[PDB]
Design a protein around this ligand. Structure first.
Ligand code: DXT
Ligand code: DXT
Ligand code: CL
Ligand code: CL
Ligand code: CL
Ligand code: CL
Ligand code: CL
Ligand code: CL
Ligand code: CL
Ligand code: CL
Ligand code: CL
Ligand code: CL
Ligand code: MG
Ligand code: MG
Lengths: 198, 198
């Protein structure tokens, strides 16, 4: 079929959904695109190369809250950013595993530069703003992995039994949204304190 | 060599370190133990079975702060628990990927039951205490994955350039320890508030 970048990414995202990350292969991608393995090699060198591009394109297609509104608070921006990051990552099977260990792409520079600039213009040192960004990113990544990977007893002590009932009664959105408010409020306590002991 | 549970786990943890999770196989485990694949099958059915046991044994060997001291605060317990969880997970390559999506083992029941009980005896509803436990777990899991997986440009805009310098200047312990204080303080704000608007 068509082998421009857009079409190779479309097929690679379908395959990721049917098979997951550990069963995504250049052999199986060649099969789905209707082509021979050496035809594929011209366009895509290895699994790593593909994985890097998939991390970028999932957010381009599905991460709609990358940038703060005019007048929006930093707290609100982190809330709306995190929910949109979580949605984009749940959209494909092992989506969060695809995003793991990547660094901003050249095509994300203007966007992530605007994000860091926004945090500094709201009173964070670059280092403290980055610590807040990284903590929201890591918490969200952790929550999506545990949910997604989870999809992949008679003598339960009583509080564990009820806790497992609580977890199994929801997809994880409730625990996620509660955790995010705790994180955002902790950053606020830290920022407002300045040089006071807190 | 010896094929009792302890010895199969020793070998599987070595192999995990040389090869990572995605390259851990029953074929390669059989090779390292000096045995044929059907000899292995009697002791270990599949990769999933192995992965479940490895998650348990990494914490048994290396997770030394499972339980609070006499008189210890809940804040202190979560701090000391999280640092010990992080250490145990960094001890092997893709350690955090091994722990992902598992639920307490029968051999962890008394331990995790004591943990949930401790949170309730410090004023948390079971649901709110579980939300705090899950948030600390997810943040830690996220931070270790990004660090571990990361191990697996000339026109950098200026704040991203300095932020990447900041991340590359440390193994991730600094960002982790800062994030954990923000999370613990947010739970405290939430718990103390009770039915007040906060
Ligand atoms: C500033 C970025 C950064 C800086 C230095 C080292 C890094 O590893 C990063 C990132 O990895 C970021 C992301 O991945 C984003 O998810 C990211 O790239 C991104 C985006 N493309 O819109 C986000 O929404 C961000 N968000 C918190 C989930 C986040 C970025 O802010 C950071
Ligand atoms: C209470 C446990 C729980 C309850 C209900 C559903 C669950 O999925 C869990 C866990 O997965 C827990 C862990 O994995 C621990 O890491 C876990 O098993 C554990 C331990 N074996 O010592 C910990 O130290 C805990 N810690 C926060 C990292 C944590 C457990 O508290 C929870
Ligand atoms: Cl074709
Ligand atoms: Cl075509
Ligand atoms: Cl083409
Ligand atoms: Cl294209
Ligand atoms: Cl491959
Ligand atoms: Cl032998
Ligand atoms: Cl022997
Ligand atoms: Cl034996
Ligand atoms: Cl044994
Ligand atoms: Cl296997
Ligand atoms: Mg990232
Ligand atoms: Mg767990």
């Amino acid at each position: 079929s068509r082998l421009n970048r857009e079409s190779v990414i479309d097929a690679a995202l379908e395959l990721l959904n049917e098979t997951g990350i550990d069963g995504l292969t250049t052999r199986k991608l060649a099969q789905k695109l209707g082509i021979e393995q050496p035809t594929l090699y011209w366009h895509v060198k290895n699994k790593r190369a593909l994985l890097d591009a998939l991390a970028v394109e999932i957010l381009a297609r599905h991460h709609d809250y990358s940038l703060p509104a005019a007048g929006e608070s930093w707290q609100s921006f982190l809330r709306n950013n995190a929910m949109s990051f979580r949605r984009a990552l749940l959209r494909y099977r092992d989506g969060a595993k695809v995003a793991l260990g990547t660094r901003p792409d050249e095509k994300q520079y203007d966007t992530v530069e605007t994000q860091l600039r926004f945090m500094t213009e709201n009173g964070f040192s670059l280092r403290d703003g980055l610590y807040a960004i990284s903590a929201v990113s890591h918490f969200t990544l952790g929550a999506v992995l545990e949910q997604q990977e989870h999809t992949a007893d008679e003598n339960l002590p009583p509080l564990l039994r009820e806790a497992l009932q609580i977890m199994d009664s929801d997809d994880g959105e409730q625990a996620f949204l509660h955790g995010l408010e705790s994180l955002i409020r902790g950053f606020e306590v830290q920022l407002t304190a300045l040089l006071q002991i807190v």
